[PDB]
Copies of this chain bind each other. A is one copy, B any other.
């Protein structure tokens, strides 16, 4: 048994200039950040011909307390396709540095399906998070400056929605009052900080097809409302040009590699509840432009990440997945059947059949609602009996979807050959009549009803009085044509985190709706959301140390 850090330290990563050569990138097309990291110039998309690569989307069932192994499968499949002689790129998200100092930080993946360098990725990496935060906080500085100087835009201070950010888990900054002191020290008002990955800049950063669309999206950001009730934008403050300049280099995707030398692109990392939870469009487009196959993923389960990948990202990017990988484990399905977190290692065919409807619902959503070829990837554990694996296979064969066993955590690309070959079969043969869940012409409530009934399995959607008032205001201002991003719990298809398996007779309770005009969707809240996490009693930072030679210990 080797830890993930031991494995990353014993692997021999190639010079990134050689990794770039695998995808036909020259020295003038990349900017080095050391010998193991590089940023890819996004202008290469204009002076090279596209390869029209295939898009493979990795999703999973609803998260369980001790699983969440979507990324290990994405990397293993990418390494597997490389073993089979394919030109493949893995497209993933960059994690937030903040949580590393609270709860222990981890690898991009795990076991022998990792991305290297592990230490840099968890920390500053190539500086993307700092640039997003600087753009977010510049807009806030220019907003408060306008109100302080003249307020010729007639901004109402009690209606300012823009919040500052920091890449730290600091509960102290959730609710603040600033602008205190002398008359030269600003205008007093209530304010607050989010974690940087929660900023709307991050969502617009990840949903821009190029630098021109980024500057336009940043300008459309609604930061406040005037006394007449009309939105005030970053463009009204003449700030989006400076924000785009701060993000000029950050928008270049970051090129790294897996343990086996497979090219990997890490770019962006928004939330999967108040945002779409996918990596940037630029990274996915660049992969499809430079490679024949692209393996990407979406956060949480297929009811949240895959739904937002298809109904938000793919719509704005003009792309369509050719195959979908649905990751699940026998332990996770038995958890949906009533087994506690301590009894999962024992064989239980009865609870496996009670939790299996969860996997079956995600299969029906991908294959019958969106009409995309799918394959179930089971991360096999040693104590998984042949009767348990045969039951999951039989119930999935009834829906026309194969079940491939995955062992990428211990064997790397060799553990994903069975999944990769089934994906290649789904791409060559098998139909793809990709359909969205809803259409843009529908109203906000019609789109919410389409998601809850088709995807979640609910009978309908209920709204609070505040929700009905906010939604109607959005319709009057012209935001009813945009997609909706539902912020609900990930542990269940419903909004109740205890309804495991496949709930039926339930309804969705909507309590808040806000506009993210930069990214181009409406955030609909079905509960309370923590946009700024807190530090525990004993933060992981207390164990982090540096020796006399500059070597970091205690990160993991």
Which residues of A line the B interface, CB within 8 A? 31-35, 42-43, 46, 97, 101, 123-124, 127, 130-131, 134, 137-138, 140-142, 144-145, 148-150, 164, 166-181, 184-187, 191, 210-212, 215, 238-239, 241-242, 244-246, 248-249, 251, 534-535, 537, 539, 541-546, 548-550, 552, 554-555
Contact = CB atoms under 8 A, between A and B. Distances in A.
B244 A138 contact: no
Contacts of A140: 170, 172
Nearest to A124: B127
Contact of A534 (B101, B184, B238): B184
B171 A184 contact: yes
Contact of A541 (B34, B174, B187, B239): B239
B181 A178 contact: no
A425 to B, nearest CB: 40
B176 A176 contact: yes
Contacts of A244: 545-546
Given A42-B550, A170-B141, A178 B179 contact: no
Contacts of A186: 171-172, 174
Nearest to A530: B184
Contacts of A173: 178
Contacts of A185: 171-172, 174-175
A169 B166 CA distance: 16
B168 A137 contact: yes
A546 B215 contact: yes
Given A34-B31, A211-B550, A138 B168 contact: yes
Nearest to A129: B130
Which 3 A-B residue pairs are closest in the complex by CB-CB distance?
A242-B541, A238-B542, A130-B130
Contacts of A242: 101, 541-542, 544
Given A241-B546, A544-B242, A134 B171 contact: no
A281 to B, nearest CB: 16
A131 to B, nearest CB: 6
A61 to B, nearest CB: 30
Contacts of A170: 137, 140-141, 144
Contacts of A542: 238-239, 241-242
A545 B248 CA distance: 10
A168 B537 CA distance: 31
Contacts of A246: 123-124
11 contacts: A123-B245, A142-B539, A145-B539, A148-B172, A171-B184, A174-B180, A241-B543, A242-B544, A245-B544, A248-B550, A248-B552
Given A168-B137, A168-B138, A541-B138, A181 B177 contact: no
B168 A211 contact: no
Contact of A124 (B130, B180, B184, B546): B130
Nearest to A41: B550
A479 to B, nearest CB: 26
A537 B149 contact: yes
A514 to B, nearest CB: 19
B175 A134 contact: no
A130 B123 CA distance: 11
Contacts of A167: 134
Contacts of A212: 548
A31 B32 CA distance: 9
A273 to B, nearest CB: 19
B166 A137 contact: yes
A45 to B, nearest CB: 11
Contacts of A35: 31-32
Contacts of A138: 101, 168, 541
Contacts of A238: 541-542
Given A241-B546, A555-B245, A537 B150 contact: yes
A380 B172 CA distance: 54
Best-buried of A239, A550, A555 by chain B (most CB within 10 Å): A550
